[PDB]
Amino acid sequence: GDWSFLGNILEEVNEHSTVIGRVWLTVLFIFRILILGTAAEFVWGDEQSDFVCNTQQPGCENVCYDEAFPISHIRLWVLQIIFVSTPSLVYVGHAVHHVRMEEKRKERRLEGTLLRTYVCHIIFKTLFEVGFIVGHYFLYGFRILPLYRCSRWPCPNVVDCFVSRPTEKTIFILFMLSVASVSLFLNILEMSHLGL
């Protein structure tokens, strides 16, 4: 996973953001992207290969892994990162559009419409963070148990399947939840600081 493109564009908008937005962005780079690439990706690497079911039924392990894990937590966190970063991109686009307009108009900072855009970007970041948190909760909760019982066809009756590294995965699930909540708190502080 090469995050160079997103990185370069978000460090562009480091220069154009509040101090609390610079903290938010540093958190995104260090506690989410870096963790994902240096730790979480390896934890989930053998998610299906080490998933085992007590059965001689061909196909059962496939369908039971798929039912237990409709989308891997790591893919969900990738999507979360991209969607929470998208409003920053929108804002920096608006800002650069104004810089190029000012240059052109001459040929021919957080005030006015850039403030409304910044506040909206904060709002959307907050809502997307909340949405991904809630979705994670309803999909998986915040704990992976070792045992998963499966009755999906072709599995005969109910079969016992065993998850890879449930405890390490639980630790990283809770870590990512905490990081997301810190991000939410930072966004709240941004709104308060702007208001006051």
Next chain:
Amino acid sequence: GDWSFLGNILEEVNEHSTVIGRVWLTVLFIFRILILGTAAEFVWGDEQSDFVCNTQQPGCENVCYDEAFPISHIRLWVLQIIFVSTPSLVYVGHAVHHVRMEEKRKERRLEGTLLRTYVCHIIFKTLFEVGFIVGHYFLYGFRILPLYRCSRWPCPNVVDCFVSRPTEKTIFILFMLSVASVSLFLNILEMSHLGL
């Protein structure tokens, strides 16, 4: 399989039967019982162990063998032998009952009621032989093909199963059919000889 009991009782009724009934009995001993024990039993010995199906489905081979072979030909021929021999036993019982009665009455051959009993015994032998022949035909025909296609649950879709020794089994099926038909002809000759 120990046929000593039946053997001794049928060689008792050798003494009390027509010449054609002695031929019938010799055929029963040599071409049916002896063949079954010295040849057929070994041919069918690995009927299920060498029955193979192209599948990874647990249980499928069991149900497919059972559907292909609801009753092994050798068990069917054992039953046939016993049922075609039963009327001879009834007749010899009647005859010995008359011998013991004559002895008793003194204390105190095929004529009369023994003739009616003999003819009835021939009739029942004929009908049972015909019934087992017809049943064999409807159940299996007179040929075992190497391939059996099976769709019985739990088999997925249709599976290809392969029979053990189909050609040798076909040879013995036809041999036993011919022996049964010879027995029928002998019974017909008995009725004719008695009539004439």
